[PDB]
RNA sequence: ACCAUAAACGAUGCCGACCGGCGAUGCGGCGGCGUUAUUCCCAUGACCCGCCGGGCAGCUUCCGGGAAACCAAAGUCUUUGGGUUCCGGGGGGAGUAUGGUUGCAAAGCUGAAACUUAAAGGAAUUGACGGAAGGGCACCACC
RNA sequence: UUAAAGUUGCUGCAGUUAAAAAGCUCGUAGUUGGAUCU
C-alpha cells in the first residue's frame, strides 16, 4: 500500500497496456517479470506493416518503411 | 530384453508401481537403470561435461584410462550425475550414462515472490560443497535465467530450475569437483524444512508391504 | 605335491551339498556314483573328485567343516536328541541378594525354587594392571 | 541421552553431582548438633568446621578441623539439625 | 580474530589502510619509485631517436633472434 | 506388552530365566545399554532388568508378527552358540536363516546368486554380527538384536537386553521369542505350555 | 508448496523421522519405516493394525534408534510403564 | 569471560537442536532471553519453556520441536533503519518466504515483519529459521 | 656485568560457552563390604569398590570439520557476527642497502627499491632405485 | 582505472604441514564487559 508502488507501479503498468506488451486483464506488478524480447519484437512497426498484409515478408516491410 | 533382478524392478515391470515419487518417498535404493528408462524415458537428455584422461604408472609402462563425466535429466523433472572410468571412451560414456540415471534425485522448486503460476527457482539458499568447491544456489526472480557459471547452468537447466542466483568458492577448474557440488545443492532441496513442511506425516504402506502377496508368485 | 586345485573341490564341495545320502567312507563307491550323477571327462579328472569326496565325508562325521553348508552340516548332527528331563528344570535355583530385590521389584519373591546365596567378600574381580 | 528429563531429575541423581552443577545449587554442609559426654551443654556446630571449638564450660574441645570435615574428638554424640 | 565492536572503526581503517601498503598492485601504484623508474613516465606511448639496431637473442626453449631497436 | 493381563511374564518364564543366567549380563556397561539395567552388584557383574528383557522381547514379537510373509525375516547368527537356534527358529516360524559367516555384500550385491532382500533382521549379537548391521544401512533394513551390557547399539533398533556369551541363555531367548512370534499369531495358545522343550535349541559342544 | 490459487505443486511430500522431526530424503538409506503389530487386548492375538514408526538415519547411526522406538512405543502404550 | 549472554543461549539451542535432543538447559537466563524465545515460540518454532528460579540468575529448560533450522545472534547490535531492513533480510534470511529477524525495538522486542506493521525501527538482535 | 637469541616447536594467540564415549593416573574431598599394621577398641596409615572437582596424558567414533595428512578441536563457517591481541598476501632480489635507535663490541629493533620470474610450494597416489634391512625360489645357481 | 578480486575480506579471507602466532609473565591507553527495578 506504498504510495510510490501505487503510483508508479501504475504508471508503469499503463505503458506496456498501451504499448501492446501486456494484456489489460494481466494488470497486476507481477506479470512484468513474465515478459519477453519477442513481446517488443512484435510491436516494431516492420513486423505491424508485415502482420497487416503490407508486405509479404519482413524485408519487404523494412524496405517499405 | 529386461529380466528385473531386484524386488522393485519385478515390481516396476509388472505395472504395481505408477510413479518415480513413490520410490522417492520411500527412499529405497534404485540398483536397476531400466527403472529410471520405465519411468522417464522418452524425456531424458544427457549431456556428456568433460572426457578426462587418468594415467595410473606401473611396472610396463602407465596404463591410460578415460574418465567421462555424464550429466542427465529430465527438463522440469529430476537430475543425475554419473562418472565413469575406463580405458575406452565410449564404454566410459555408457557406463556414464547408466551410473547417472542411476543416481537421479527430484528436486524441489520454489517461489521467489508471490506464489502465482508454477515454481521456477530454488526454496531457499542451498549450498553443495565437494572437495573444496562451494556452490550456493539463491533464489532469483520471475525470469532472469540461470546467473551461473557454465558447468552448474547445464545442471540447473536440467533439473529444471527457470532462473537462480548461484555463488562460487574454491578451484572451480576442477570440473568434477564443480559438478558434483552443485548436484549436492540441487540434491538438497527437499531435505531442507520448511514451514509448509510442518504437517505431520501420515504414513503410508510401502511398496514391499502392499504388493507382498503379489511378490510372492514370482 | 598333491594339492588339488579348486576344479576337484569346488566339484566336490557342490557333490557333498547335493548328495550326502549317496556318498559314504569307501573311495570306490563314491567313484561310481559321481560318474552317473556328474558328467565328468577324461577319467584323471573322475578319481581325484571322488578321493577328496570320501576324505571329505570322513571329516564332516567328526564335526564342522567351514567349506560347506551349515544348514546341512549341523542337520545331520541332529539326525544322527532329547533329554528326559530339562536342563532349566531345576530345583534349586541359587541367586544373590541384589537378584532378589530385583524379583521383589519384578513382584516375585514369592518363589519357592530360589536359595539365596551369599556373594563373596572381596571386591576383586579387574585383573593386576602393569 | 536425547530424550532426558532435565526439569525432574531423580533424587539419587541431583545429589551426586557437583553442588554448583545441580538444577538449583545446594550446599553439601549441615549443622550438627554436639553432645559432650562428661558435660551437659549441647552445641552447634559446622560440619565443615575451621578453628577447634570448645564447649565453654568443660573447656574441652569438640572438632579439630580437617580439610574437608570437621573430625570430633572421640565419644562425642551428634545429631544433625533439621 | 578480528575486533568487531561497535567503537572499532579507528582500527578497522588503519589496519586496512596498512595492510593495502602489502600488496603489489597498491605498492606499485602509489609509491612512487615506479612511475620514475618507468622511462614513458606514465604515458601510453613515447617518441625516440633511433640509435642502433639489435639483435637480441630468444629464451631457452625455443630459438631465434628477435629485431629489436635501440632507440 | 502394553499392561495386558495376557501378556504379562508368568512365574515359569522367570524360573527359566534365572535357570539360563540371562539376567547376568557382562563386567562392562555400555551407555546406551543402562537404561535396562538394575544394578551392578559386587564381582563386577551387571544385573538386567528381567522386566525389561521381557517387555523388549515382546516389542521384538510385534514387530516380527507386522510382517505377512514370513519369510521376509531374516535371522543371523555367526558364532557357533547361536547356530542352532537360529535354525529353528525359522522352522517354527517360517523366517530365513543364515548361519555361520555372513557374505559382505548379501545385502547390497543384486548381481550375484546370494542376494537377498529381507524386510527385517534379527541378529543375536551386535558385536560378531557387526557385517550384516553395517549392511542394513544401505537397504533401508530394521533390526533386532539380542544385546548384551557391553554391546554397541549402532543400527539396532530393536535391542532386547539378555545375556549372550553363555550358550543356554542364547537358546532361552530364541525359544522364547519363538514361542511369543507364535503366540502373537493364529497358532498356538497362551493356555498350554508349548509343546517344544527349549532344549532343542542349546548348543552343546563336543 | 501451495500457490496462491491453492493448488499443490510439489512432486511429493517426504516423510519426517518420528524421533527428531528431520526430513527423511531420498537417497537416505539407512533410514527405516517399521511398523508395530497391534494384538487384541484380551486375546493378546494380532489384531491386524499395526503402529508405523519412521527414523532417519543420523539418529540410527548414533545408536538412539533403540531409545527413539522405545519412547515412542511407550506413547502409543504398548510397552507398558516401567 | 562471558560477554553477550544471548550469544551464549543461541548458540547452545542450535546445537542440541542438531544433536536431536529434546530439551536444552540453558544458563543465566535473562529478560531479553525470554523476550527472544517467546517471539520464536509464537512462530512455531521452539515450544514450551521453564524458567527455573534460581535467587541468582535464572535457567531456562526450553523443549525443542525439531523445526529450527539456525538460531543466531547479531553482534554488535547495529541500529537498524527501516530504510535499511531490506539489506539485512537479504543478507540474513533464507528466503523471502520464511524466516525472521528479531529487533530490539522502542515498542518491545518483536520481529522484522511486525516492525514494519508499527513502522518501527531499532537494534537487531539476531534471526532465526 | 653486558648480550636477549633458537626445530625458543603442539612446527598450533589469550578469555568464555556449547558439543560423544572409555579406562587409567596425580592431588584434595565424600562414601562403602572385606584384608593387613599400631596387641583389643576406635582413630588412622597400606590395599580394594565407587562418586565429585580441577590436572598431565592416552585410546576410540560417520559430532562435525578439512586440500588431505589429520583434529574432540584445527568442530559449532556461504545456515558466514561471543570478546580481543599480533601477524600473512605468487617465487626471488633480501631480512640486503640506506636512515634511525640500543649496545664497548658482536649484535638488537626497525627496514626498502631498482630488477628478475610462470611458477615456486603443500598433502596424497601409483610406479623407479640402492653399496638399507627382512622373506620365497632355480644343477641354463650353489653344495 | 573499475568489475572479475571472498587475491585487502565491514558484509567477507587467512596464520600445524602451502606466506604466516610475539621466549615468557606483568601492564597504560584503546576495544569489550554477568543477572537485577511495571
Redesign the pocket.
Given at each position: 500500500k506504498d504510495p510510490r508502488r501505487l503510483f508508479e507501479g501504475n504508471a508503469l503498468l499503463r505503458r506496456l497496456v498501451r504499448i501492446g506488451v501486456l494484456d489489460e486483464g494481466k494488470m497486476k506488478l507481477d506479470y512484468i517479470l513474465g515478459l519477453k524480447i519477442e513481446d517488443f519484437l512484435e510491436r516494431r512497426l516492420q513486423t505491424q506493416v508485415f502482420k497487416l498484409g503490407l508486405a509479404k515478408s519482413i524485408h519487404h516491410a523494412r524496405v517499405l518503411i | 530384453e529386461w529380466m528385473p533382478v531386484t524386488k522393485l524392478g519385478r515390481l516396476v515391470k509388472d505395472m504395481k508401481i505408477k510413479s518415480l515419487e513413490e520410490i522417492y518417498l520411500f527412499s529405497l535404493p534404485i540398483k536397476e537403470s531400466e527403472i529410471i528408462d520405465f519411468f522417464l524415458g522418452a524425456s531424458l537428455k544427457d549431456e556428456v561435461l568433460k572426457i578426462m584422461p587418468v594415467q595410473?604408472?606401473?611396472?610396463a609402462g602407465?596404463r591410460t584410462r578415460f574418465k567421462a563425466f555424464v550429466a542427465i535429466g529430465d527438463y522440469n523433472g529430476h537430475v543425475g550425475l554419473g562418472v565413469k572410468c575406463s580405458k575406452e571412451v565410449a564404454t566410459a560414456i555408457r557406463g556414464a550414462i547408466i551410473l547417472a540415471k542411476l543416481s537421479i534425485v527430484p528436486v524441489r522448486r520454489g517461489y521467489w515472490g508471490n506464489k502465482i503460476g508454477k515454481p521456477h527457482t530454488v526454496p531457499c539458499?542451498?549450498?553443495g560443497?565437494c572437495?573444496?568447491v562451494?556452490?550456493?544456489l539463491?533464489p532469483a526472480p520471475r525470469g532472469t535465467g540461470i546467473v551461473s557459471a557454465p558447468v552448474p547452468k547445464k545442471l540447473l537447466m536440467m533439473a529444471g530450475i527457470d532462473d537462480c542466483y548461484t555463488?562460487?568458492?574454491?578451484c572451480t577448474a576442477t570440473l568434477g569437483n564443480f559438478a558434483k557440488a552443485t548436484f549436492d545443492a540441487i540434491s538438497?532441496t527437499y531435505?531442507?524444512l520448511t514451514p509448509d513442511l510442518w504437517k505431520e506425516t501420515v504414513f503410508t504402506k510401502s511398496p514391499y508391504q502392499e504388493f507382498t502377496d503379489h511378490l510372492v508368485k514370482t | 605335491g598333491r594339492v588339488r586345485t579348486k576344479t576337484v573341490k569346488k566339484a566336490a564341495r557342490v557333490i557333498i551339498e547335493k548328495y550326502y545320502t549317496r556318498l559314504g567312507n569307501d573311495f570306490h563307491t563314491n567313484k561310481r556314483v559321481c560318474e552317473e550323477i556328474a558328467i565328468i571327462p577324461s577319467k584323471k579328472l573322475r578319481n581325484k573328485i571322488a578321493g577328496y569326496v570320501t576324505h571329505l565325508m570322513k571329516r564332516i562325521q567328526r564335526g564342522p567343516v567351514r567349506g560347506i553348508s551349515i544348514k546341512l552340516q549341523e542337520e545331520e548332527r541332529e539326525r544322527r536328541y532329547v533329554p528326559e528331563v530339562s536342563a532349566l528344570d531345576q530345583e534349586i535355583i541359587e541367586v544373590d541378594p541384589d537378584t532378589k530385590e530385583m524379583l521383589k521389584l519384578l513382584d516375585f519373591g514369592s518363589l519357592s525354587n530360589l536359595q539365596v546365596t551369599q556373594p563373596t567378600?572381596?571386591?576383586?574381580?579387574?585383573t593386576p594392571?602393569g | 541421552?536425547?530424550a532426558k528429563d532435565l526439569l525432574h531429575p531423580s533424587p539419587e541423581e541431583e545429589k551426586?553431582?557437583?553442588?554448583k552443577?545441580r538444577l538449583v545449587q545446594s550446599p553439601?554442609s549441615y549443622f550438627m548438633d554436639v553432645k559432650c559426654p562428661g558435660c551437659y551443654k549441647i552445641t552447634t556446630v559446622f560440619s565443615?568446621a575451621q578453628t577447634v571449638v570448645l564447649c565453654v564450660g568443660c573447656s574441652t574441645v569438640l572438632c579439630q578441623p580437617?580439610?574437608?570435615?570437621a573430625?570430633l574428638t572421640?565419644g562425642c554424640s551428634f545429631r544433625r539439625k533439621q | 580474530?578480528?575486533?568487531?565492536?561497535?567503537?572499532?572503526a579507528?582500527?578497522?581503517r588503519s589496519?586496512?589502510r596498512d595492510?593495502?601498503?602489502?600488496?603489489?598492485?597498491?605498492?606499485?601504484?602509489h609509491?612512487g619509485?615506479?612511475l620514475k623508474?618507468?622511462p614513458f613516465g606514465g604515458a601510453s606511448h613515447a617518441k625516440g631517436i633511433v640509435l642502433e639496431k639489435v639483435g637480441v637473442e630468444a629464451?631457452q626453449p625455443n630459438s631465434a633472434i628477435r629485431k629489436c631497436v635501440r632507440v | 506388552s502394553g499392561a495386558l493381563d495376557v501378556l504379562q511374564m508368568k512365574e515359569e518364564d522367570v524360573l527359566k530365566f534365572l535357570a539360563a543366567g540371562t539376567h547376568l549380563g557382562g563386567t562392562?556397561?555400555?551407555?546406551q545399554m543402562?537404561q535396562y539395567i538394575y544394578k551392578?552388584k559386587?564381582d563386577?557383574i551387571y544385573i538386567i532388568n528381567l522386566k525389561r528383557t521381557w517387555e523388549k522381547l515382546l516389542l521384538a514379537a510385534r514387530a516380527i508378527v507386522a510382517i505377512e510373509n514370513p519369510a521376509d525375516v531374516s535371522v543371523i547368527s555367526s558364532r557357533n552358540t547361536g547356530q542352532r537356534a537360529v535354525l529353528k527358529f525359522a522352522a517354527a516360524t517360517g523366517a530365513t536363516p543364515i548361519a555361520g559367516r555372513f557374505t559382505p555384500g548379501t545385502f547390497t550385491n543384486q548381481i550375484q546368486a546370494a542376494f537377498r532382500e529381507p524386510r527385517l533382521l534379527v541378529v543375536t549379537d551386535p558385536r560378531a554380527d557387526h557385517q550384516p548391521l553395517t549392511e542394513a544401512?544401505y537397504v533401508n533394513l530394521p533390526t533386532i538384536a539380542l544385546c548384551n551390557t557391553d554391546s554397541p547399539l549402532?543400527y539396532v533398533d530393536i535391542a532386547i537386553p539378555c545375556n549372550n556369551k553363555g550358550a543356554h541363555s542364547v537358546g532361552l531367548m530364541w525359544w522364547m521369542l519363538a514361542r511369543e512370534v507364535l503366540r502373537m499369531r493364529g497358532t498356538i495358545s497362551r493356555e498350554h505350555p508349548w509343546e517344544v522343550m527349549p532344549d532343542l535349541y542349546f548348543y552343546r559342544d563336543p | 508448496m501451495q500457490n496462491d490459487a491453492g493448488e499443490f505443486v510439489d512432486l511429493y511430500v517426504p516423510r519426517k523421522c518420528s524421533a527428531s522431526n528431520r526430513i527423511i530424503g531420498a537417497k537416505d538409506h539407512?533410514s527405516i519405516q517399521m511398523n508395530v503389530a497391534e494384538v487384541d487386548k484380551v486375546t493378546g492375538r494380532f489384531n491386524g493394525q499395526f503402529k508405523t514408526y519412521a527414523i532417519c538415519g543420523?539418529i540410527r547411526?548414533?545408536g538412539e534408534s533403540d531409545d527413539s522406538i522405545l519412547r515412542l512405543a511407550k506413547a502409543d502404550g504398548i510397552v507398558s510403564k516401567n | 569471560?562471558?560477554?553477550?549472554?544471548?550469544?551464549?543461549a543461541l548458540?547452545?539451542i542450535?546445537?542440541?537442536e542438531?544433536?536431536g535432543?529434546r530439551q536444552?538447559?540453558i544458563?543465566?537466563?535473562?529478560?531479553?532471553i525470554?523476550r527472544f524465545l517467546t517471539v520464536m515460540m509464537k512462530h512455531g518454532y521452539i515450544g514450551e519453556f521453564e524458567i527455573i528460579d534460581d535467587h541468582?540468575?535464572?535457567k531456562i529448560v526450553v523443549n525443542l520441536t525439531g523445526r529450527l533450522?539456525?538460531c543466531?545472534?547479531?553482534?554488535?547490535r547495529?541500529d537498524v533503519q527501516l530504510k535499511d531492513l531490506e539489506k539485512?533480510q537479504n543478507?540474513?534470511l533464507?528466503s523471502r518466504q520464511f524466516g525472521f529477524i528479531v529487533l530490539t525495538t522502542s515498542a518491545g522486542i518483536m520481529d522484522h515483519e511486525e516492525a514494519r506493521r508499527k513502522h518501527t525501527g531499532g537494534k537487531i538482535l539476531?534471526?532465526f529459521?
Open positions: - | 595410473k604408472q606401473t611396472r602407465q539458499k542451498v549450498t560443497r572437495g573444496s562451494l556452490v550456493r539463491i555463488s562460487a568458492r574454491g538438497k531435505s531442507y | 567378600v572381596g571386591m576383586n574381580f579387574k594392571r | 541421552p536425547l551426586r553431582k557437583h553442588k552443577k553439601n565443615h580437617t580439610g574437608g570435615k573430625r572421640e | 580474530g578480528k575486533c568487531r565492536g561497535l567503537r572499532t579507528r582500527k578497522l589496519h586496512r595492510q593495502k601498503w602489502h600488496d603489489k598492485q597498491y605498492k606499485k601504484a609509491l619509485t615506479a623508474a618507468n629464451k | 562392562n556397561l555400555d551407555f543402562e551392578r559386587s563386577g544401512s549402532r | 539407512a543420523a547411526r548414533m | 569471560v562471558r560477554m553477550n549472554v544471548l550469544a551464549d548458540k547452545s542450535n546445537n542440541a542438531k544433536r535432543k536444552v538447559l544458563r543465566p537466563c535473562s529478560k531479553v525470554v541468582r540468575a535464572g533450522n539456525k543466531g545472534v547479531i553482534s554488535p547495529f539485512w543478507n540474513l533464507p539476531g534471526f529459521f
